[PDB]
Amino acid sequence: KPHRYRPGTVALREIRRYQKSTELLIRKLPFQRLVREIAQDFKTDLRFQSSAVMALQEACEAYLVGLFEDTNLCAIHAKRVTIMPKDIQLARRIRGERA
Amino acid sequence: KPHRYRPGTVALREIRRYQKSTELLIRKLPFQRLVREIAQDFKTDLRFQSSAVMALQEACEAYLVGLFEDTNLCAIHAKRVTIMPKDIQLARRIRGERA
Amino acid sequence: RKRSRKESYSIYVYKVLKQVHPDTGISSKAMGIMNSFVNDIFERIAGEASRLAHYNKRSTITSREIQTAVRLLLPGELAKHAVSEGTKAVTKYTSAK
Amino acid sequence: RSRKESYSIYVYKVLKQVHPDTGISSKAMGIMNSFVNDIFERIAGEASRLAHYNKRSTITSREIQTAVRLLLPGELAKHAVSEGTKAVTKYTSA
Amino acid sequence: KAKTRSSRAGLQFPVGRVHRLLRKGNYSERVGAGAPVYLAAVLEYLTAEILELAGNAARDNKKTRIIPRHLQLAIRNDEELNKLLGRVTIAQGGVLPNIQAVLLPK
Amino acid sequence: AKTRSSRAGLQFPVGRVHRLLRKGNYSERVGAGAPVYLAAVLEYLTAEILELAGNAARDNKKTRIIPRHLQLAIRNDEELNKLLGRVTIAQGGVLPNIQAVLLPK
Amino acid sequence: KRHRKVLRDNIQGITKPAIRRLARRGGVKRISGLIYEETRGVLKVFLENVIRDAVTYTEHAKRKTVTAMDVVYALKRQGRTLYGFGG
Amino acid sequence: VLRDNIQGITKPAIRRLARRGGVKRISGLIYEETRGVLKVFLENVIRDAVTYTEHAKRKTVTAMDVVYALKRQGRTLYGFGG
DNA sequence: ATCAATATCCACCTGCAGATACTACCAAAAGTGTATTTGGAAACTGCTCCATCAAAAGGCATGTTCAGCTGGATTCCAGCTGAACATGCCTTTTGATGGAGCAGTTTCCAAATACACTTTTGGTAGTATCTGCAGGTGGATATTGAT
DNA sequence: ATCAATATCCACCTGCAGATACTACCAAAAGTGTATTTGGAAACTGCTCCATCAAAAGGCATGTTCAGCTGGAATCCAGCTGAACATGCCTTTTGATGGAGCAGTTTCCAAATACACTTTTGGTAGTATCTGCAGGTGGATATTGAT
Ligand SMILES: [Mn+2]
Ligand SMILES: [Mn+2]
Ligand SMILES: [Mn+2]
Ligand SMILES: [Mn+2]
Ligand SMILES: [Mn+2]
Ligand SMILES: [Mn+2]
Ligand SMILES: [Mn+2]
Ligand SMILES: [Mn+2]
Ligand SMILES: [Mn+2]
Ligand SMILES: [Mn+2]
Ligand SMILES: [Mn+2]
Ligand SMILES: [Mn+2]
Ligand SMILES: [Mn+2]
Ligand SMILES: [Mn+2]
């Protein structure tokens, strides 16, 4: 039989891998694309410093990682190990980001 | 034959009662003693404007009420109707009061 | 000895109350709340305008700083209307003398 | 062309005093600069409010101190107060 | 005959006082003439907005006098005022009646 | 002529701190003691972080402090973490931490 | 000339019915037995932090009397702004 | 292929973010939920950033514009000036 | 228990992007000295309001009994999500290249500040008198729960 | 559904605390006018760095299969927590008194601002040398999962 890791094993491996490193985890150009599109709805023909986009990605990724931590606690609170939209919503509600 | 409301009926009546009113729910004099005890442990021979104590009590009650709201959402998230210490702790962690 | 004068926004809040609800009064405790509200929003807008002027190396807070500060601080419709009422008041003020 | 001030060379001096054989990347130096600026603003801002609250037009070492107590956690605040008191004493005598 | 800067601006809120508070508050070295006018207008508008909704809340409760409860009801029921005052506590305001659906009997 | 920093026994620039204070519109006046005290507090705080971050570099077998080391120092220190609780360090990443219930067996 | 009685254990003046009432206003229907001591602990931390800051303002003003403004300023900087007592 | 920009924020990238957040198992609906949350965050920050740009009468969003906007939203960022 | 498949770690190596050490140049900034102004500490004290008192009383806390129904444990299984592999698509690199526009410099005037003098006003302060509604009662309607 | 116990509703009323009303007073505020200063807008422009372009290179995202195991549904039951009751204590309320200490007013000097002048420094720009460590290698060995 060809080798195969149990479900959850590789995931735990990835957790250790990414909690060890600091590199950004969203692709640069797709992110740069998203930012410019959103900015366009506020003011037309804008240009961006490269450091401006980088500041945005760092702040945005750090925000999502922290949010995922809270989300994880909410899932575990409900005796699950799987995070659900239910969990993200509860975290954001208690954070005061909504409702 | 002696009348009994089912468990939960009176609790709901009480929720409606206190969500309708605005008066302070902690007894005035005991709260004043607590304030003086705590302040004394920080600095001796302090005096208090009466409105200062009331300012503290308005803030403390509004804080706890808001905390019980979040706590309630945490218990419901776990598919319970009964709030527990682990709900309070979860709400305070996500709030960033212990994180 | 005279106790020093304690300024508040009460008589102005009251005027606006009568414009908006001619037959409605307001308790002193509610007036207390309204006074806290005006002072709070005052400090918020003024603080934001202060930072704004400093980020742009300006030593003057003009109506333009106040306006941007209002856009930063207020949400949606509130910003829209506040800006309009502010612009209106300034144009009127300058159109005199 | 104009110049841009930074705390870099002062951060570097302090580094060599605590870890003489340790270097620091430019990215890490950017972080330290953000740190110094942030804490400056926090402390200055709090000192400002203190003076205003008490109808004072002068921010003195006393305002900086109360501000530090309000802003820093226990032990960090203790040492900071001591370091600040020390520097003002040595500045008075010298 | 002098005209107040408030009447000159067509405002109920005091332009003179706002200008004075701006200078005394150490926000900048200089304060332009349009700044207190604009700010007074914004403050007045916001005041009108809240008093409008609080007056309605009072009426809804068969009262003719606005009390803190009415101010709280008006603020928490308006999505935008709630956002602006999301970190504010109204003394003697209480909370909105709100019972989570799952708590009701069936 | 001896600088105020030398006169105060400080590495951080007192004159600059004083100038930043009065130009920041924090008050009408600034006492001579205030920029000394504030410069001292800032230097001390800088030292504490650089010390802890330096150790973090040592532990990682590096001689050069990078963002990651600053993050490790701050988040592993109870008081520094509290002081900088609402601050994100660019390129800092997070502390290694896995909830027990997620571990196998 | 004379001193006041010793103040101790006053946290228990925050009774179970008082905590139940606060929970009701917060929309809570059912309450576990361990909530009451947990709530007292949480309340004490909140109170200590606000009072510490307030008293710090008091002392800076060289006063012996904690004012409502001291409290309001303390609440403000803790991110718990309070309307109805203040400036 | 026709492609929306928020959909450019891919599932595997969202997965890596969750991993750094210490998340072991992810529900299928998370990825769309995340993108929506991402968008609101970016909108809020960029709006304030652009507002600083306009006030300075510029056509270029600077790192400082972003840094100031982040500080407004209580998301203070170290390392990009300020 | 054995045993094979991968992941992971350690030791060493090398190219280079980023750190450093140097010399020179200069505008701004920090130090020095002097003359002038003034904020706020001291002293004195009027007077608000805080601490403490007593005393009566009923609203409410405490403690117990009782059992309804909630939380927690257990089992079970459909199906969702992780792992792995096969494609192939587009992000990444980097290097050059206009040129947009940030930013530096010069000019200069509308508007700000400083100031002296005149007038208006909002804030007590002292009484004097309406009035919205809290809280009481009573009796009609509604809700809940047993049967 | 019927019914009985109890909460809820609402109209009515009365006491009164708190809101409204007036005059008198006045210190500070606000407004006017003149003179003097200057922030920053405007116009022009050099140089930074941003957008775009090509163009492989391939790393990484996407689609599919299979099944391990997780989430959710169902079932049971011990016992926790809610409801109701009896008891009586301690909070609440009302009013008074002394005096602590907050706060208002005035005198006054140490310290801060304001200039003018001199000197030092930190940011700078080239210019050249140096080095910590990322990234690649191999081989040891730890981990995981099949038996
Ligand atoms: Mn004690
Ligand atoms: Mn004076
Ligand atoms: Mn039973
Ligand atoms: Mn159940
Ligand atoms: Mn051009
Ligand atoms: Mn008047
Ligand atoms: Mn009633
Ligand atoms: Mn000029
Ligand atoms: Mn199966
Ligand atoms: Mn399971
Ligand atoms: Mn008893
Ligand atoms: Mn005395
Ligand atoms: Mn030098
Ligand atoms: Mn390596």
> For chain C, which residues make up each domain, given as ranges?
1-97
Q: What is the CATH number of domain F1-105?
A: 1.10.20.10
* Nearest partner of C74 among G76, E81, E54, E51, judged by Cα: E81
Q: Most A CBs within 10 Å: which of B94, B95, B97, as the mutation test of the A interface?
A: B94
Q: How far is CA C64 from the centre of its chain?
A: 15
Strands D58-59 vs G65-66: parallel, antiparallel or unpaired: unpaired
Which protein residues have a CB closer than 5 Å to ligand 1 (ion)? B 41
Report CA(H17)–C1'(J54) in Å, whole number: 33
- Cross-strand pairs, F89: H78
Ligand 6 mean position to H72 CA, how many Å? Answer: 42
CB-nearest partner of F64 from D25, D58, D79? D25
CATH superfamily label, H1-82: Histone, subunit A (1.10.20.10)
- F–H touching, 3+ CB–CB pairs within 8 Å: yes
E101 touches strand I (CB under 7 A): no
Ligand 7 mean position to B17 CA, how many Å? Answer: 14
Closest chain B residue to E94 measured between Cα atoms? B22
With 0-12 / 13-18 / 19 or more C-beta atoms within 10 angstroms meaning exposed / middle / buried, residue E82 is middle
Residue D77 CB neighbour total at 10 angstroms: 18
Three-class SS of residue E88? strand
Q: What is the CATH number of domain E1-106?
A: 1.10.20.10
Backbone angles phi, psi at D68, to 5 degrees: -65, -40
CA E6 to CA E3: how far, in whole Å? Answer: 8
Please tell me if residue F3 touches chain D, with a CB cutoff of 8 Å.
no
CA A82 to CA D81: how far, in whole Å? Answer: 48
CATH of G1-87, one of 1.10.510.10, 1.10.20.10, 3.30.360.10, 3.40.1800.10: 1.10.20.10
- Cross-strand pairs, D24: F65
Residues 55-74 of H with CB under 7 A from strand I: 57-60, 62
Structural domains in chain A plus CATH codes: 1-99 (1.10.20.10)
CA distance H17 to chain F (A): 11
CA E84 to CA C76: how far, in whole Å? Answer: 11
* Nearest partner of F37 among F54, F62, F12, judged by Cα: F12
CA F40 to CA D36: how far, in whole Å? Answer: 12
* Nearest partner of B22 among E81, E71, G20, judged by Cα: E71
- Way the structure was solved: X-ray
Ligand 12 mean position to G61 CA, how many Å? Answer: 18
The resolution, in angstroms to one decimal, equals 2.4
Contacts of C9 (CB under 8 A, 6+ apart): C34, C35, C38, C39, E13, E47
Q: Number of D to F CB contacts under 8 A, please give it.
A: 182
Residue D57 CB neighbour total at 10 angstroms: 11
Q: Number of D to H CB contacts under 8 A, please give it.
A: 18
> For chain F, which residues make up each domain, given as ranges?
1-105
Backbone angles phi, psi at A8, to 5 degrees: 110, -30
The residues in D 59-88 lying below 8 A from F, measured between CB atoms, are 59-61, 63-65, 68, 71-76, 79-80, 83-88
- Cross-strand pairs, G31: B83
Q: Which residue has the tokens 């709340």?
A: C33
Identify the contact set of chain G against chain D, taking CB-CB distances under 8 A.
53, 56-57, 59-61, 69, 73, 77
Please check whether residue G66 is in contact with residue G58, taking contact to mean a CB–CB distance below 8 angstroms.
Answer: yes
Q: What is the CATH number of domain D1-94?
A: 1.10.20.10
Tell me the two tokens of residue B87: 């709900």
CA G48 to CA G46: how far, in whole Å? Answer: 6
CA distance F27 to chain C (A): 13
The class of domain C1-97 in CATH terms is mainly alpha
Three-class SS of residue B12? helix
CA F49 to CA C33: how far, in whole Å? Answer: 43
